[PDB]
Structure formats: structure tokens, C-alpha cells
Design a protein around this ligand. Structure first.
Ligand SMILES: O=C(O)[C@H]1O[C@@H](O[C@H]2[C@H](O)[C@H](O)[C@H](O[C@H]3[C@H](O)[C@H](O)[C@@H](O)O[C@@H]3C(=O)O)O[C@@H]2C(=O)O)[C@@H](O)[C@@H](O)[C@@H]1O
Ligand SMILES: O=C(O)[C@H]1O[C@@H](O[C@H]2[C@H](O)[C@H](O)[C@H](O[C@H]3[C@H](O)[C@H](O)[C@H](O)O[C@@H]3C(=O)O)O[C@H]2C(=O)O)[C@@H](O)[C@@H](O)[C@@H]1O
Ligand SMILES: [Cl-]
Ligand SMILES: [Cl-]
Ligand SMILES: [Cl-]
Ligand SMILES: [Cl-]
Length: 230
């Protein structure tokens, strides 16, 4: 039988501050249900150690969505509210099966758009350089479809071992730290000033697969939203 993520202590803080969306953005498990042992092949404890997410299908997800703690409703914050908003993780991204092309593993999202996606991607060229099997950041600086609406950055080549991530937003600026090194330093998010519906997400969100049957799989060794106000 599949062991539940809540059976160890590692993820209890974030589970108290998240709902699980699966296989779409529909509710799969409330925070209370997650803390109460919700489990399935899409969301279970791997190796007694990893919160593992799995999903197949284009634009499908198995993803935690930040909630107000202690049974609260959906959170919404703003990049320019003056507070530092922080998400941390330690992620083992396994080799992805054929047909999986891009897996979003952390986000800042709002009511209408992704401000940031951190994603694994099989193969892509950025600013004239081809990259394979790597972790990328995609920041939106507008809602249009043309490339000038995005800033897309190679963060790191995928590693077999755990990779640490931290996302910080303060005063309309974004920093991303990977394995302890700042890779995105103060990216401008001021396009989003006044949008009060932002929130963190993390898990597996499957983008542009070439087979809808192919199952994306992502293992979290750690995940938290870090409250600077205590
Ligand atoms: O190599 C390129 O830069 C290609 O960029 C493509 O545009 C991307 C865009 O950068 C962004 O990644 C976007 O991401 C969407 C995501 O796939 C999901 O649909 C959902 O999360 O919404 C995201 C969003 O709309 O921000 O998807 C497109 C994409 O097609 O992958 C293209 O312009 C491509 O031609 C170009 O080579
Ligand atoms: O296009 C998507 O799939 C986006 O869905 C986003 O989640 C929304 C979405 O509306 C979803 O159905 C669900 O909506 C709830 C929620 O409680 C909401 O606050 C409302 O009051 O009730 C809705 C309901 O009854 O279904 O949750 C959403 C949310 O913001 O959490 C995100 O998953 C996006 O990332 C995604 O692009
Ligand atoms: Cl298990
Ligand atoms: Cl083990
Ligand atoms: Cl995999
Ligand atoms: Cl996140």
C-alpha cells in the first residue's frame, strides 16, 4: 500500500498551508485532508523521505497551492505589499519518461497568470544557446504572447541529487537561489504591482507533452512557505 506524505513530520508545515489540486485545478485534498493522510499514486511518500507528485496529460497537474494556514482559504498577496514572500524547496527531479517535455515544479501564480514558473525542460534554446535536461525560470513581465512578455533563464542543469531552490519576492523584485547561489538577482516584477491575488505553488504541472499518457514524476525532499512575520 502507498504511504501517505503526512506519515512523517517533514512536510507537515506546508501541508498545513496548502491544498492539493489534481488532476486539474479542481480540489483533490484540502489542507485538513492532507494532514489527515490523503494518499494516492499521484501523491505519496517515496523512499520514506520524498513527497512525490505524478501526473500525465497536457496541462494537468498534481500541485500544492498556497493557503492561509490552519484550515484557511486561498491566500492572495502582492509583489508590492512590502513583505518578503519566500518559498523554499529541495527537489529530486528524476529522468523524465519519453513524451514529458516540460514540468513546472514551483510557481508564483495569480488569479489570471503565472508570474513565475520554475520548470524542468527537456530541450530548449534561450538567447541563442541550446540547453538540454535543465531547470529554467520563466517570468512574465506582461500578459501578451510575444517573447517580450517573458524573461526566460537557464537556472541549472538537472542533477541526479537533490537541488535546493528558494524564491523571494520583495518590493516588486524577484530573486531565485539554486543550491545556495543567486541565479536570478532582483528581476523586476513591477508589472504586477497592485495584483493582490498572487500565491505560491509547487508539485508537478505538465506542459506541452508529446504524449498525454506519459507520466511526469517529481520528488520533494523539502518544501515550505517561509513567513517573515512570525
Ligand atoms: O523558446 C521559446 O522562447 C518559445 O517560447 C514559447 O512561448 C512560451 C512562453 O515562453 C511560456 O513558456 C508559456 O508558458 C505557458 C505554459 O506552457 C502553460 O501553458 C501555462 O503555464 O501558461 C504559460 C504562459 O502562458 O505563460 O508557453 C509558451 C509556449 O508555447 O511554450 C513560444 O513562443 C515558442 O514559439 C518559442 O519558441
Ligand atoms: O486554469 C487553471 O486551471 C488555474 O486554476 C487555478 O485555480 C483556481 C481555479 O479557479 C480552481 O477551479 C479552483 O477554484 C476554487 C477556489 O476555491 C476559488 O477561490 C473559488 O472561490 O472557488 C473555486 C471553486 O469552487 O472551484 O482553485 C483556484 C485557485 O485559485 O486556487 C490555479 O490552479 C492556476 O494555477 C491555474 O492556472
Ligand atoms: Cl508509500
Ligand atoms: Cl529509503
Ligand atoms: Cl520520471
Ligand atoms: Cl513556489
Amino acid at each position: 500500500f502507498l504511504t501517505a506524505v503526512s506519515s512523517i513530520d517533514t512536510f507537515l508545515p506546508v501541508l498545513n498551508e496548502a491544498k492539493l489540486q489534481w488532476p486539474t485545478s479542481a480540489l483533490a485534498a484540502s489542507s485538513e485532508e492532507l494532514l489527515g493522510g490523503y494518499v494516492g499514486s499521484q501523491f505519496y511518500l517515496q523512499d520514506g523521505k520524498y513527497m512525490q507528485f505524478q501526473i500525465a496529460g497536457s496541462s494537468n497537474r498534481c500541485e500544492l497551492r498556497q493557503m492561509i494556514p490552519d484550515g484557511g482559504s486561498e491566500i492572495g498577496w502582492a509583489v508590492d505589499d512590502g513583505t518578503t514572500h519566500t518559498a523554499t524547496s529541495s527537489i529530486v527531479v528524476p529522468e523524465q519518461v519519453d513524451g514529458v517535455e516540460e514540468v513546472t515544479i514551483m510557481q508564483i501564480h495569480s488569479g489570471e497568470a503565472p508570474q513565475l514558473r520554475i520548470s524542468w525542460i527537456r530541450s530548449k534554446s534561450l538567447d541563442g544557446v541550446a540547453y538540454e535536461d535543465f531547470i529554467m525560470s520563466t517570468v512574465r513581465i506582461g500578459t501578451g504572447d510575444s517573447s517580450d512578455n517573458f524573461v526566460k533563464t537557464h537556472l541549472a542543469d538537472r542533477t541526479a541529487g537533490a537541488m535546493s531552490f528558494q524564491i523571494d519576492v520583495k518590493d516588486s523584485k524577484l530573486t531565485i537561489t539554486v543550491n545556495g547561489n543567486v541565479v536570478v538577482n532582483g528581476q523586476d516584477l513591477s508589472f504586477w504591482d497592485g495584483t493582490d491575488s498572487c500565491y505560491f505553488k509547487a508539485g508537478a504541472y505538465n506542459n506541452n507533452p508529446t504524449s498525454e499518457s506519459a507520466t511526469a514524476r517529481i520528488k520533494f525532499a523539502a518544501l515550505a512557505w517561509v513567513d517573515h512575520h512570525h
